[PDB]
Amino acid sequence: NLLETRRSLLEEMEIIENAIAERIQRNPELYYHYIQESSKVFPDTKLPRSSLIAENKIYKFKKVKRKRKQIILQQHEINIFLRDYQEKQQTFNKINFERKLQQLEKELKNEDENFELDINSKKDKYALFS
Amino acid sequence: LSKGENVPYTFQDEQVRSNPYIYKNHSGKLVCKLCNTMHMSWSSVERHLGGKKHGLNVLRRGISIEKSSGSVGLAIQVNYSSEVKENSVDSDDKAKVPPLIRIVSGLELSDTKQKGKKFLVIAYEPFENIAIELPPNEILFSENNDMDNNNDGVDELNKKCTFWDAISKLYYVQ
Amino acid sequence: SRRDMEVIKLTARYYAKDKSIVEQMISKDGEARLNFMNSSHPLHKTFTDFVAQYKRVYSFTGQEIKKSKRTILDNCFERTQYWEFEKDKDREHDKLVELCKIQFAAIPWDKFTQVAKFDLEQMRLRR
Amino acid sequence: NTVYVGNIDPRITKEQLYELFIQINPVLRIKYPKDKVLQAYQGYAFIEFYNQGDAQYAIKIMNNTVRLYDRLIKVRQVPIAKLFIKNLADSIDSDQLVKIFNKFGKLIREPEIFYLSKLKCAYVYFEDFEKADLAIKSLNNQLVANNRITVDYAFKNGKGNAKYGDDVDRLLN
Amino acid sequence: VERKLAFTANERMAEMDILTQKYEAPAYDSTEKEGAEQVDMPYWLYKLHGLDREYRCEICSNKVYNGR
Ligand SMILES: [Zn+2]
Ligand SMILES: [Zn+2]
Secondary structure (H helix, E strand, O other): OHHHHHHHHHHHHHHHHHHHHHHHHHOOHHHHHHHHHHHOOOOOOOOOOHHHHHHOEOOOOEOOOOOHHHHHHHHHHHHHHHHHHHHHHHHHHHHOOHHHHHHHHHHOOOOOOOOOOOOOOHHHHHHHOO | OOOOOOOOEOOOOOOOOOOOOEEEOOOOOEEEOOOOEEEOOHHHHHHHHOOHHHHHHHHHHHHHHHOOOOOOOOOEEEEOOOOOOOOOOOOOOOOOOOOEEEEEEOOOOOOOOOOOOEEEEEEOOOOOOEOOEEOOOOOOOOOOOOOOOOOOOOOHHHHHOEEEEOOOOEEEEO | OHHHHHHHHHHHHHHOOOOOHHHHHHHHOOOOOOHHHOOOOOOHHHHHHHHHHHHHHOOOOOOOOOOOHHHHHHHHHHHHHHHHHHHHHHHHHHHHHHHHHHHHHOOOOOOOOOOOEOOOOOOOOOO | OEEEEEOOOOOOOHHHHHHHHHOOOOEEEEEOOEEOOOOEEOOOEEEEEOOHHHHHHHHHHHOOOOEEOOEEOEEEEOOOEEEEEEOOOOOOOHHHHHHHHHOOOOEOOOOEEEEEOOEEEEEEEEOOHHHHHHHHHHHOOEEEOOEEEEEEEOEOOEOOOHHHHHHHHHHHO | OHHHHOOOHHHHHHHHHHHHHHHOOOOOOOOOOOOOOEOOOOHHHHHHHOOOOOEEEOOOOOEEEOOO
């Protein structure tokens, strides 16, 4: 059922956005740095208040300054994340009764003796990107 | 020198004092009851208060104090001022704090005569306290009304069953 | 839990299109399998999620998402900003609560002056 | 000869207390402590009668009988051998300690197990210094539960002085 | 370039050391912060009163008493 696949896709995209957003949260520099450079390549780009940039804050809380190696690292990580996202968005674009309900619900009875705890779909993903 | 304040005698059995210490004993002379010092003139008193030993005694008194000290329910609708007197006080001093309710046992009263029942006291900074007698041992005492969310505010009672229409100044309690 | 998951997600798939096939299934079969249909069963809540999600997939069917890198970044920044804001609201709340605790703890509950003797959730809103 | 009194109204005066308790028995003195800071009493008192019998009888009669300003008044009445032991086995329960040391001496209290350094040690309370001398004589540097244990006197430098033997001998006698 | 160029031997060496350390260092130290956001005695008394003067009593465990 394509519905399930497209669902899982939108969900994963959500997960990634949330990850790189958490990152941009802990150390605003990640975005700021980037954005500043972008400013001088695409002149239109709107950039945050200077005060925010300096105090390394996004709203009220000023975050601890990080060293260069880490900023760059996380930027490349976010890079691959955005790659994944672009891929999923792509496949998704390329992908997007009662008797059948009971029909499938019947086959769901298959292998009743499957003693196993299953807590690994959103946790393995959430975890896969944190 | 005294700034025109009347310093009462020690024996006069207590108009709020400026410094609630310096007295005049049965004799004429001036005293500081903390430091147990006798002062001849008010200038010497002002030097005592500006002295170091009196500060030490004030702190030691500070520490000395700080170490010791399907059913039926009721609903109340309390109304408050209509911007009549609250126009002179708006300095965000607990102004954001809503009225508060507490259940008090009559076992303790200013007169201590009769007792044996509870009161649903309701209080707000300027206005005077209010009470409501509750003979019934228990009414409307519910069981997990909401789904256990933890913002204690003041207590389970207040969050559980109170509403503060601050825009109209109406406090509902049930 | 694969069974439960699968039945929740399936009944959620069908429930997302008609909502009539399940209400008929319940009366036709009579199985303690779909006991999550009632808001009583905890899992029901997660159900309400899945369906919504599927309901969402039905939203832009026939429409592609053309978000660019720049945009995705901007978005994640704005989300961050939001989170920060929410965090601030939480903080403020905690503060006010603190004030309340202080004052409640600091008023005379012995200054009595009584007079007589003896649903709010939908009321604590606005309309 | 003195009895404790509690749950007293700070408004109560020594006059009222005396008038109350003289009904029960002759009262030699009443020490009713006041805070000299606030000139406010603390809500308790000590009432000293002449003999013990009057005190006991007053305790029996006046407890929870009378309410003063609704407040129900309360009336109430009012050095041994020690051994440090080191390198104990973790399999030794305090009760097993009891069974070990009972044959050597009668325990006034129970042993105390505490860990130093990991290192299981204990304090053992005997009613006698000589029984403890037996416990040390037999048990010192001895293997129990496949572990060598050391038995000596606990520090206060430790117990077992001459004055200690004398005054412990007297407390026993 | 100009800096390194105007260095001495020891200086240039220590600087190189620094660049090296920066190069081969963990991107996250075991000693970093998480959630540290900012916003926007009577000495003379005992000698007078007699205390803190060692004294001994034989009858109770040969006990010591710090004041008379
Ligand atoms: Zn003074
Ligand atoms: Zn002594």
